[PDB]
Design a protein around this ligand. Structure first.
Ligand SMILES: Nc1ncnc2c1ncn2[C@@H]1O[C@H](COP(=O)(O)OP(=O)(O)O)[C@@H](O)[C@H]1O
Ligand SMILES: Nc1ncnc2c1ncn2[C@@H]1O[C@H](COP(=O)(O)OP(=O)(O)O)[C@@H](O)[C@H]1O
Ligand SMILES: Nc1ncnc2c1ncn2[C@@H]1O[C@H](COP(=O)(O)OP(=O)(O)O)[C@@H](O)[C@H]1O
Ligand SMILES: [Ca+2]
Ligand SMILES: [Ca+2]
Ligand SMILES: [Ca+2]
Ligand SMILES: [Ca+2]
Ligand SMILES: [Ca+2]
Ligand SMILES: [Ca+2]
Ligand SMILES: [Ca+2]
Ligand SMILES: [Ca+2]
Ligand SMILES: [Cl-]
Ligand SMILES: [Mg+2]
Ligand SMILES: [Mg+2]
Ligand SMILES: [Mg+2]
Lengths: 815, 361, 372, 362
C-alpha cells in the first residue's frame, strides 16, 4: 500500500488531495487546496457523511497539459486507493474546464483556480539518435578498423578503404591504391554493421567515381552532404601519406589486451589475462572480462553467471581507463552481455566459433514401421460401438427410380423391391412431437452406371433444396444398407439382379422371368434380405434359405444353418406363387430339384455354415493395409463382398480354415505381412483349436464356393468374369487356380548357401530366373566366378566400404 | 430432341462432346497457334490462326500460346478460336442449334463468367447456356453429393470441399502446380543424367514417359534409398529414334513435387497440406464426411500410388480416430465432362438454362 | 538501481523497451526466417535462421513464419529466438539483470502463461517477472479507469470492458479477425486486378500497401459507386523492384472486413456489433460510461476513417439518446507498452514482482496467484 | 604452410597457379590433339594441327571427355606448373549448373589418378563475386565457349535464374573472320585465326549505339584502325571493330535465336524474387575475357536501364583484372587459414567416396 494513503481516515469524513509527481502521489498542502496546475494530475478523495450513510467519491483530475505518465499514474493510483478503501468509493474522471458538478461543489468558495505550469514529467524521452562516423580499414593480412575523429577528406587517403556509416546508409569508399585484402575485409565489416542493426544499404563507391551518374542522384546528394567532392582534390591524402599497412596492423594488434574481473574468496581483483591473438574460449561465463582496444574502444564482456559486484566494478574500472589515459571523448566503452556479441566485438578475437561445414515448408509424414500384434484381434471387438436410429421406420416414404436420366415414382405395391443395376432416391419424412424432418436416401446399385448414380445424386440435392435444405442426405451403396434404411422397408428387402438402360438404352429386360433363384439371408432380425442369384447349384449356401421359382412350381430350399426369420420370408415370397410352395430340407433333395439347377455340383457348404451360432464361433474378417503409413489390421463386422478392396489383403477366420484373400492391386509387402500376421494369429489363439489349422491363400477371382459362402451373396461378374468356380476350373484348371497354403519362412544367408547362377544370367536386366536377390546379385555368383569378375574374393569384397562395393557392382553390371 | 453440348475448358486439354454420352467425343490441346513470319506462306497471314493438334504439327512456323494457362481464361481473342474449333471442326455442329454447358475453374471471377456468357450469345449465338464448377461435376460423376475434391490438371490444382451439392468457397485452395510443371521437372532431372531433353518434340516424349513410368512412392525416403542400392526400380524407354534410355528415381521424384513443391522452387504446400487445410477451414460437423469422401479428379491424379500416399499423409495430420477414405474413379481424367454430360441430360436443366431472350435484357 | 524492462510480445510486432521511457525503443516484426536455398559462398556469415528486421531485410531468400498465429503461440522454439533477439540484439541488455514486465491477451490459457514464465526464469534467468493484461494497460495509458477497449492487432481483436480498473470477464468479446486476415484478403482481391502476391515475402509487401493506402469508408456502398464513377480514389504503389501497381476500390474493401466479416467467410459479427454486444452484457448502470469511453488499441485501428465509421455504426445500434465517443489516441500502436512503462515505474510495483526465489519454491503456478 | 593449387578449368583456357599469388602462373588453351590416324595438349597441340585432330574437352563449360581431361590436368601439374600433385591441395572450379555426377567424376580423378592430399570444387561465378568482396550480385561470366548469368544474393544461390548462352569468345573471332573475309581480306587458315584473335583483342570495342556508330563509319573514316600482319602487310579494319562484339547483344549476327547478354541479364534478374532485384541491378559484376571489350560496361548500363524501371539504379562493376577474377577469387579462398577445414581429405574420400564433394563442398 502506498504510504501516502496510509493516513487516510478509514470510515470517517475527510477531504484529501494529492498531486502526481514522478509516478508518486504527493499530498497537496492544505492551504493550497483549490489551486490545480494545468500541467499536472491530481487525486481528490471526498468522504462525507449524509444522514448516517457515508458518501465516498474519488476523483482524479487531469490538467489540459498533463503528460501521459501523470494521467496514467493518476488512474492507477485512483484504483489502488479505491481498493485500499474496500472498493466502496465511486471513481470520477475530471478534465479541466469540464469537471462534474460534484467536483465543482467542493470549491464553492470560488477557490477553484487553474495555475500555470506544473511539475516535470517522469517519462524519459527516447530520441533515437544516429552516430554518424567515418571509419578506416587498413592492413596487410587482417585489416584493422579505426574511427576517424571527423568526417572530411583530410582524414582519408587514396591507399586504404573507408566506411561512411550514416545509420541506415553505409558508403564503402575504395581507394585507388587499396589492396584487394582491405576491400574484402571492409565489405565484411560493412555487412556486419548492417546485420547487427537489421536495416541499411551498403553503397560501394570507387575512388574517382563520386559522381551522380555513377552513384545515383539521391545517393550522391547524401555523400556530398558529408564529403563534398569539390574539397577532395585539395585535402585527400596520398597512398604513402596514409602510412604503411604493415605498421597500422602491427601496432593495433599489440594494442589489444584482455583483462579479468573476478571475485574469488570475496576479493575483487583485476588481472590481465592474455593479449593478441584472442579466442572466444578465453571468456568464462562465471566472471567478467574487459577487452581493451585503447583509443579505438573498450568493451566489457559480462558473463551469464557473473557476480553483481563483478558486473559493477568491471564497468567502473573500464570507465576509469578513459580518464586515467585521458582518452578523447570519441573513445567509448560498451557493455557486451554474453550472447549479444556484435560483429565489431567479435572482430577483436581472431578465433570465434567455427566455420559452417554443411528448409522446406512442405512437411512429409515420417512414420516408422511397427510390427502388428495379432493378439489384439483376439481381444474381441466393440461391434455395437455406434448405433442410432431417429425413428422406427413408420414414417412416410416416396421411392423414385432413375429412369431415362429422370425420376419415376415406384408404385406402392413394389415397395421393398430394388433392382441391383439401377439407382433409387427415397424421400423419408418422419415427425417427432409434431416437427417434421426429412431424410433423403439415394441407393446406388452395384451395377448402376455413372449416369444413374449422378442423376440420383443431383436430384437428391434438388429435393433437399425443395425443402429449404433442411433434409439430411445419406449415400447408400448396395449390400451396405444402414439400419434405419432397412427399418423403412420393415426389415425385408428384395434385390432383383437386373437393371434398366444406361447411357442411352439397351436390352432393359423388365423382370426376373419365371425361372430365377433368390438368396435369403440376414445377420440380425432386421437386415433379412432376398437377393436374386444365378440359378446354379454353386449359388446354394447351407447357412441360408433359397426360393426357386419355375413354371412347374415354386420350391423352398432350407439349408441346415438357416434361421427361422429366413424361412418366414421365403414362405411369404412363395405364398404369392399360384402354384404353391414345396419346402425342401438339405439332404432331402429330390433329383427334380437339381435338374432345375443344372445338376448337383459343389456348393457353399462347410462345418461353420451348417452349424448354428450357438455352437460354432462366427466368422471374422480382417482388412490388412499399410496405406496408413504402417501395416495395421482391422475387423469388419457384418462383412459382405463390397467390403473387399483389391488394393489390400484380407484374412478370414472360419474356425477350420483361415483364408488369406490377395487383392490384385495390393502391394507385395502387404501380402507378405498379411501371411505372417495370419501365422501369428492362430499361434496366439487361446481357444484351444488345432495349432496347425489350414491357412490357404486365395487369389481375387479364383475364390472357392466355401470362401464366398461366409460372405452374403457373391457376384462373380466383378472379378471372375461371371464364371462360377466350376466353370473357372474347367477353363483354367485345378493346378491353375489352386489355393496355395501358407508356410513359415530368404535373406542373410551365407555366400555359400545362396543359389548360384552364371554371370551371363545375373548381368541381364529383364527375364531373370526367379529367386534372385536383385539387391545382392553378386552373392549369386560362385566363389571362383566372383574372383574372376571382381578381381577379388567375396571375403575381401565385403570388407571394402559400402560406397566401393556399389561402384564395383555398377562397373560389372551387377547393380 | 435438341441435343446439348458439354465443353470442359481445360488448362491444357479441351474436352468437348454431346450430353448424354459416356465420354467426350473430342479432346484436343488448349493451344492457339499464330504465324511467326506473317505473309511468307499461304495460310500464314495476320488473321490466320491454328488450334489444337494442327498447331502442334505446324509448331515450327507458329508461335503457340496457352489461353487458359492457369484455369482462368486470359486471352479471349484466342479463346474464341478454341470454341470455334470445337463447334465447327471437332464436334462439327452449329452452335446456334444446341444449348451449351461450359465449365469454369474454382473461384472464377464474376467478370470472366460475364465475358464467357457474352461471347457465346453474341459471337456464337447459342440458344441457351450455363456455366458449372468443375469440381461439382466431378463429384456428381462419383455418385456423391458431399466430398472434398482434389482436381489436378495441366496448369492448376484445386481443393474444393462440397457438402450436400454446394461448395464452400472460403475453403477452396489453389496450387499453381500440375502436370505441365511435372513434365517440365522430368525434363530437368532427365538432363541431369545427360539424356538432353530440351526441344518441344522432346517434351512430347517426356510427357509420355511421365504418364507410363512415373509413380508416387509410399515412403519417398525409403524408395530413394532403394533406387541407390539396386536397379530394381529402373525401367527402360525406347525413344522414336530407337535409342533406349533408363530412368530410376526420376520415376517417383517427379510426382513427389505434388507433395514437396520445393523441388521446382515453389514455397507453397503439398497437395496433402492444402487438402488438410481445406477441410480444417470448414465447419467441424462436416469434417467427418469430407475425410471419408476425398474424390480425386484430373489427369495428374492418375499416377499409381497417389491414393495410398494421400491417405498416409492426411492420416498423419488428421485426428487419429478419423476414417480417411480416398476415392479414385477409373475415369477421373474426364470426371468433369462426364458430370457435365449427366447434368446437361437432366430434364430439370430447362429451368436452369439462361436463354438468349433473358440475356437481351 | 535495477531498471525494469517492458516487453509487449504481439502476434505481428514486438514492442520492447525500458520502464520509464515514453515509447518503446525496440519495435520489430516477430518473424523467424529460414533460407529457401543453399549457401554457395563459404565463410560469408550465413545463418541458419534470421529474426526480426534482418529477416525482413533478407526476406527474398527466406520463408517468413510467425511464431504467434491468431494470438496463440505455435512455435515455442521460435518464440525463444524472438525473446533472445529482443534482449541481446535490439535492447542489448543482460536479461539476468533486469526485471521484465510481459503482456498477455485477456482470458489467456494458463498453459501459455506458465510456459512463458518458465522460459523467462530458466532460459534467460530474469531476476523477476510479471504479466499484465494488454487491454487494461491501454485504458490506463489514456488516463482512464472505466471504458471498453477495442484491441485489434495482427492476430486477434478483443473487446474488453473495464470498470474502475477491473475488467468484466463475462463481457469480453473475441473476434478471430485482425491485421493478418486483412492482409491475406488484400492479397486475394489484388489478383482480380492482375497482380500476384503468393510467397510469405510478398505478403509483407501487401501489408505495407495496406498500411499506406487503405482506409475505412464512412458509407461503403456509396464509395463503391464513386469508385466506378471516376478515378479519384485510385492510388499508385511502387514495388521493391520498381514496378508500379495501382489500386482503387481495394483501398476500403480490405478494412471493410472488420465491419463485414463475411468478406473472408466468417459468419461472426463486425467490430461495431461486437462492442455493442459487449456493452450490452454489462450492468445497465455502467453502460453510459462505456458508450462514452471507447478506447481503440492496436495497429489495425489506425485506418483513416475507422473512428468516424465506428461512431456512426454504434450510434445506429445504441439508443438515440446515448452519447457515443470513440477515443483514438495518436500513439495507440504502442498504448499497451506505454501503460506497462507506467505500471513498472510505480514504487508500489516492487511488491508485485514474481521473483526467482518464489519461482524455485513454488513453480510456474505462482504466476497466476499474482495476476488475477 | 602447404602451398595449395588453383586450377580454373575454363572452356578455352586453363588458368592455373599457386594459392596466394596475384595471378595464375600458367595460362594455356584447353585443347588436346590426337593422331587422327597419342597425346598432345596445349600450345604444342596447336603447332601440330595438320597432324592431329583437336577437340575441346570443356567446349561449353561442362566437361565432356574425361580421358582427354585427365591429360589437361596432367599437362597442368607436370608440364606447366612443374609440381607433384600428391603434395599440394588443389582447388578446382566448375561451371554453373554443373551436374552432380560431373563433380563426382572430378573428385574421383583427382584422388584416384593424381592422388592429391585434399581437394575442393568451387563454382566459377561465386569465386568472381568473392574477388570483389561481395556476397550479392549477378555475375556476367563471358569466356571462350560459354557465357553465364549467375545471380547470387547474400551468399545464397538462385539456380532457377541462372542463364546460359553458348555464344562467347570463339564465336566472336570466327565471326570476325567471316566479316573480314567479306570486305576483301582472307582469313580461313588456322594460323590466320590466331591473327584474327589478336585483331579482336586489340582493336574491337562495343558501341554505345550500334546504328549510330554504323552511320558514322558510313560517312567518315575516323573509326578505321590499322593492323600489321606478321608478313608486313598492313590492313584496315572498319565497322568490323564494333560489329564483332555486337553479336553479344544481337546473336542473330551468327544465326542464333537467343537474346543478347543484356536481355539474359535482365531476364535473369526478373526470375529472382522481387525483394532481391534492387541489389542485383546495382551489382552487375563482369568476369571473363569477353567482358574486356572497351565500352561493353557503358553499353550494358544503357541497355539494362531501358529494360528496368526508371526508379532503379543500374550499376555495372567492371573490375580491371576480371579476365582472371575466377582464379583470383580461388587464390584468396584457398589461402585463408579458415579454409583448411573445408578441404576434402583423402582419408574422407576413402570412407565415403566421391559423393562427399556434395557434403563439404556445395
Ligand atoms: N496416366 C497419366 N499419368 C500421369 N499424368 C497424366 C496421365 N494422363 C494425363 N496426365 C496429365 O494430365 C494433365 C492434363 O489433364 P487434364 O485433367 O485434362 O488437365 P486440365 O483439365 O487442367 O486441362 C497433362 O499435363 C498430363 O500430363
Ligand atoms: N497505418 C496502418 N493502417 C492499418 N493497419 C496498420 C497500420 N499500421 C499497422 N497496421 C497493422 O497493425 C498490425 C500491428 O498491430 P500491433 O498492435 O503491433 O499488433 P500485435 O498485437 O500483433 O503486436 C499489423 O498487422 C499491421 O498490418
Ligand atoms: N582484351 C580482350 N578483348 C576481347 N576479348 C578478349 C580479350 N582478352 C581475352 N579475350 C577473349 O576471352 C576469351 C578467354 O576468356 P576466358 O574467361 O579465359 O574463357 P574461359 O574461362 O571460357 O576459358 C578468349 O576467347 C579471348 O578471345
Ligand atoms: Ca506535469
Ligand atoms: Ca469502487
Ligand atoms: Ca592500404
Ligand atoms: Ca564469479
Ligand atoms: Ca441401370
Ligand atoms: Ca440439407
Ligand atoms: Ca443365415
Ligand atoms: Ca494397399
Ligand atoms: Cl497512447
Ligand atoms: Mg481440368
Ligand atoms: Mg499488441
Ligand atoms: Mg570461364
Amino acid at each position: 500500500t502506498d504510504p501516502a494513503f496510509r493516513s487516510v481516515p478509514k470510515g470517517t469524513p475527510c477531504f484529501l488531495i494529492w498531486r502526481i509527481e514522478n509516478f508518486q502521489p504527493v499530498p497537496v498542502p492544505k492551504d493550497q487546496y483549490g489551486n490545480f496546475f494545468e500541467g499536472d494530475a491530481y487525486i481528490i478523495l471526498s468522504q462525507k457523511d449524509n444522514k448516517g450513510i457515508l458518501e465516498q467519491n474519488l476523483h482524479f483530475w487531469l490538467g489540459k497539459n498533463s503528460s501521459q505518465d501523470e494521467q496514467g499514474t493518476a488512474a492507477l493510483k485512483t484504483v489502488e486507493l479505491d481498493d485500499y478503501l474496500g472498493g466502496t468509493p465511486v471513481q470520477h474522471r475530471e478534465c479541466q474546464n469540464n469537471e462534474s458538478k460534484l467536483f465543482l461543489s467542493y470549491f464553492k468558495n470560488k477557490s477553484l483556480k487553474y495555475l500555470q505550469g506544473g511539475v516535470a514529467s517522469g517519462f524519459n524521452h527516447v530520441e533515437h539518435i544516429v552516430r554518424r562516423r567515418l571509419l578506416s580499414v587498413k592492413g596487410k593480412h587482417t585489416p584493422r578498423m579505426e574511427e576517424k575523429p571527423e568526417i572530411s577528406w583530410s582524414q582519408m587517403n587514396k591507399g586504404d578503404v573507408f566506411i561512411l556509416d550514416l545509420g541506415e546508409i553505409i558508403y564503402v569508399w575504395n581507394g585507388e591504391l587499396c589492396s584487394r585484402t582491405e576491400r574484402i575485409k571492409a565489405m565484411e565489416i560493412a555487412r556486419g554493421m548492417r546485420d547487427d542493426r537489421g536495416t541499411g544499404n551498403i553503397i560501394v563507391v570507387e575512388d574517382g567515381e563520386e559522381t551522380p551518374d555513377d552513384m545515383g542522384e539521391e545517393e550522391f546528394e547524401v555523400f556530398n552532404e558529408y564529403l563534398p567532392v569539390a574539397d577532395k582534390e585539395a585535402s585527400i591524402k596520398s597512398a604513402e601519406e596514409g602510412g604503411a599497412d604493415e605498421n597500422f596492423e602491427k601496432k593495433k594488434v599489440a594494442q589489444l589486451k584482455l583483462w579479468k574481473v573476478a571475485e574469488e574468496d570475496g576479493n575483487l581483483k583485476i588481472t590481465e589475462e592474455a593479449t593478441a591473438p584472442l579466442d572466444k574460449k578465453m571468456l568464462d561465463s562465471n566472471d567478467c572480462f574487459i577487452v581493451d582496444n585503447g583509443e579505438d574502444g573498450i568493451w566489457v564482456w559480462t558473463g551469464k553467471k557473473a557476480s553483481p559486484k563483478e558486473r559493477k566494478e568491471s564497468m567502473n574500472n573500464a570507465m576509469a581507463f578513459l580518464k586515467q589515459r585521458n582518452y578523447s571523448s570519441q573513445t567509448r566503452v560498451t557493455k557486451v552481455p554474453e550472447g549479444g556479441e556484435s560483429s565489431e566485438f567479435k572482430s577483436l578475437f581472431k578465433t570465434w566459433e567455427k566455420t559452417k561445414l554443411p528448409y522446406s515448408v512442405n512437411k512429409i509424414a515420417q512414420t516408422v514401421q511397427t510390427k502388428f500384434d495379432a493378439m489384439t484381434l483376439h481381444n474381441n471387438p466393440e461391434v455395437a460401438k455406434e448405433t442410432g436410429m431417429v425413428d422406427d421406420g413408420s414414417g412416410k416414404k416416396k421411392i423414385y427410380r432413375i429412369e431415362n436420366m429422370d425420376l419415376v415414382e415406384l408404385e406402392k405395391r413394389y415397395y421393398g423391391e430394388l433392382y441391383g443395376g439401377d439407382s433409387y432416391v427415397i424421400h423419408y419424412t418422419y415427425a417427432v412431437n409434431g416437427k417434421e424432418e426429412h431424410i433423403i436416401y439415394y441407393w446406388l446399385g452395384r451395377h448402376s452406371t455413372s449416369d444413374e448414380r449422378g442423376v440420383a445424386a443431383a436430384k437428391t440435392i434438388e429435393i433437399d433444396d425443395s425443402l429449404g435444405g433442411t433434409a439430411k442426405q445419406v449415400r447408400v451403396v448396395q449390400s451396405k444398407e444402414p439400419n434405419h434404411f432397412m427399418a423403412m422397408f420393415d426389415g425385408k428387402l428384395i434385390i432383383f439382379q437386373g437393371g434398366k438402360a444406361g447411357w442411352g438404352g439397351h436390352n432393359s429386360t423388365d423382370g426376373p422371368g419365371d425361372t430365377y433363384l433368390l438368396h435369403v439371408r440376414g445377420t440380425s432380425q432386421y437386415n433379412t434380405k432376398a437377393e436374386q442369384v444365378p440359378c446354379r447349384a454353386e449359388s446354394l449356401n447351407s447357412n441360408d434359405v433359397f426360393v426357386l421359382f419355375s413354371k412347374g412350381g415354386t420350391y423352398v430350399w432350407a439349408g441346415k444353418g438357416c434361421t427361422g426369420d429366413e424361412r418366414e420370408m421365403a414362405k411369404k415370397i412363395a405364398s404369392k406363387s399360384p402354384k404353391g410352395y414345396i419346402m425342401i430340407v438339405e439332404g432331402q433333395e429330390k433329383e427334380e430339384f437339381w435338374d432345375l439347377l443344372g445338376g448337383k455340383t459343389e456348393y457353399a457348404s462347410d462345418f461353420s455354415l451348417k452349424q448354428a451360432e450357438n455352437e460354432h464361433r462366427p466368422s471374422r474378417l480382417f482388412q490388412c493395409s499399410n496405406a496408413s503409413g504402417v501395416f495395421k489390421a482391422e475387423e469388419i463386422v457384418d462383412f459382405v463382398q463390397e467390403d473387399l478392396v483389391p488394393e489390400d489383403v484380407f484374412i478370414l477366420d472360419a474356425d477350420h480354415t483361415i483364408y488369406v484373400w490377395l487383392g490384385n492391386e495390393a502391394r507385395n509387402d502387404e501380402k507378405q505381412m498379411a501371411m505372417d500376421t495370419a501365422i501369428e494369429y492362430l499361434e496366439s489363439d487361446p481357444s484351444g483349436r488345432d495349432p496347425d489349422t489350414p491357412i490357404m491363400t486365395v487369389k481375387q477371382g479364383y475364390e472357392p464356393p466355401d470362401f464366398v459362402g461366409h460372405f452374403g451373396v457373391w457376384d462373380r461378374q466383378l472379378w471372375s468374369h461371371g464364371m462360377s468356380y466350376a466353370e473357372l476350373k474347367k477353363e483354367l484348371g485345378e493346378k491353375n487356380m489352386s489355393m496355395e497354403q501358407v508356410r513359415q519362412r530368404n535373406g542373410e544367408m551365407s555366400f555359400s548357401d545362396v543359389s548360384k547362377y552364371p554371370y551371363s544370367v545375373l548381368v541381364q536386366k529383364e527375364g531373370l530366373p526367379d529367386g534372385i536377390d536383385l539387391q545382392n546379385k553378386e552373392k549369386h555368383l560362385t566363389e571362383e566366378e566372383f574372383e574372376k569378375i571382381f578381381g577379388m574374393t567375396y571375403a575381401t569384397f565385403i570388407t571394402k566400404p559400402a560406397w566401393k562395393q556399389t561402384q564395383l557392382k555398377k562397373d560389372k553390371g551387377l547393380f | 430432341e435438341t441435343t446439348a453440348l458439354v465443353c470442359d475448358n481445360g488448362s491444357g486439354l479441351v474436352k468437348a462432346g454431346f450430353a448424354g454420352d459416356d465420354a467426350p467425343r473430342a479432346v484436343f490441346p488448349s493451344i492457339v497457334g499464330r504465324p511467326r513470319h506473317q505473309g511468307v506462306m499461304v495460310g500464314m497471314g495476320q488473321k490466320d490462326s491454328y488450334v489444337g493438334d494442327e498447331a502442334q504439327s505446324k509448331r515450327g512456323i507458329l508461335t503457340l500460346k496457352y489461353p487458359i494457362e492457369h484455369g482462368i481464361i486470359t486471352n479471349w481473342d484466342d479463346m474464341e478460336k478454341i470454341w470455334h474449333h470445337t463447334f465447327y471442326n471437332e464436334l462439327r455442329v452449329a452452335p446456334e442449334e444446341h444449348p451449351t454447358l461450359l465449365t469454369e475453374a474454382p473461384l472464377n471471377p464474376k467478370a470472366n463468367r460475364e465475358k464467357m456468357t457474352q461471347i457465346m450469345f453474341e459471337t456464337f449465338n447459342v440458344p441457351a447456356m450455363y456455366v458449372a464448377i468443375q469440381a461439382v461435376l466431378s463429384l456428381y460423376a462419383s455418385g456423391r453429393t458431399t466430398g472434398i475434391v482434389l482436381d489436378s490438371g495441366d496448369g492448376v490444382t484445386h481443393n474444393v470441399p462440397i457438402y450436400e451439392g454446394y461448395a464452400l468457397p472460403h475453403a477452396i485452395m489453389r496450387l499453381d502446380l500440375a502436370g505441365r510443371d511435372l513434365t517440365d521437372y522430368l525434363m530437368k532431372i532427365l538432363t541431369e543424367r545427360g539424356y538432353s531433353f530440351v526441344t518441344t518434340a522432346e517434351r512430347e516424349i517426356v510427357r509420355d514417359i511421365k504418364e507410363k513410368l512415373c509413380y508416387v512412392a509410399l515412403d519417398f525416403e525409403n524408395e530413394m534409398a532403394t533406387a541407390a542400392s539396386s536397379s530394381s526400380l529402373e525401367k527402360s524407354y525406347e525413344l522414336p529414334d530407337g535409342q533406349v534410355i533408363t530412368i530410376g528415381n526420376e520415376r517417383f521424384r517427379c510426382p513427389e513435387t505434388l507433395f514437396q513443391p520445393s523441388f521446382i522452387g515453389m514455397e507453397s504446400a503439398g497437395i496433402h497440406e492444402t487438402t488438410y487445410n481445406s477441410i480444417m477451414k470448414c465447419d467441424i460437423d462436416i469434417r467427418k464426411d469430407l475425410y471419408a469422401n476425398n474424390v480425386m479428379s484430373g489427369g495428374t491424379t492418375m499416377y499409381p500410388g497417389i491414393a495410398d500416399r494421400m491417405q498416409k499423409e492426411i492420416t498423419a495430420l488428421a485426428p487419429s480416430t478419423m476414417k480417411i477414405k480416398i476415392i479414385a474413379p477409373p475415369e477421373r481424367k474426364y470426371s468433369v465432362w462426364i458430370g457435365g454430360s449427366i447434368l446437361a441430360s437432366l430434364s430439370t436443366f430447362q429451368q436452369m438454362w439462361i436463354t438468349k431472350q433473358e440475356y437481351d435484357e
